[PDB]
């Protein structure tokens, strides 16, 4: 019956109501010209019709880097020795970044002592 088609199209090959809606319509255009013998034939026909339906809709069912890292290993070693020559600190910005980041963590630790004590409505 039609109940078996739902579990053989929307279930077997995964075909829900909407999927089977246009799946059973494709059979008409190519209905079996005679009473189908095998129960698998019907499923096969449905599956065969599903292919067309799916088609119709278009929805079917090394060391190079080791050589590279040694090149940057040379240039990183060359970068430190030129910064050593020109007396350029390569981390003066980074050391002052982490030293103000704990300094702005101190004033944050003082700023939330106000809002924990007083509250959000009073502070706003």
């Amino acid at each position: 019956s039609i109940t078996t088609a739902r579990k053989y199209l929307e279930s077997r090959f995964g075909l829900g109501a909407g999927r089977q809606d246009s799946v059973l319509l494709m059979a008409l255009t190519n209905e079996p010209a005679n009473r189908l013998g095998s129960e698998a034939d019907a499923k096969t026909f449905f599956d065969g019709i599903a292919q067309k339906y799916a088609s119709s809709a278009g929805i079917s069912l090394a060391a190079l880097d080791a050589l590279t890292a040694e090149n940057k290993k040379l240039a990183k070693q060359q970068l430190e020795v030129l910064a050593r020559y020109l007396q350029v600190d390569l981390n003066k910005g980074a050391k002052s970044f982490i030293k103000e980041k704990e300094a702005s963590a101190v004033l944050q630790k003082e700023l939330d002592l106000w809002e924990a004590e007083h509250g959000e409505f009073y502070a706003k």
Binding site: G14, A17, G18, A57
Partner: peptide, 5 residues
């Protein structure tokens, strides 16, 4: 599978 009515 997308249920298409």
């Amino acid at each position: 599978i997308p249920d298409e009515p």
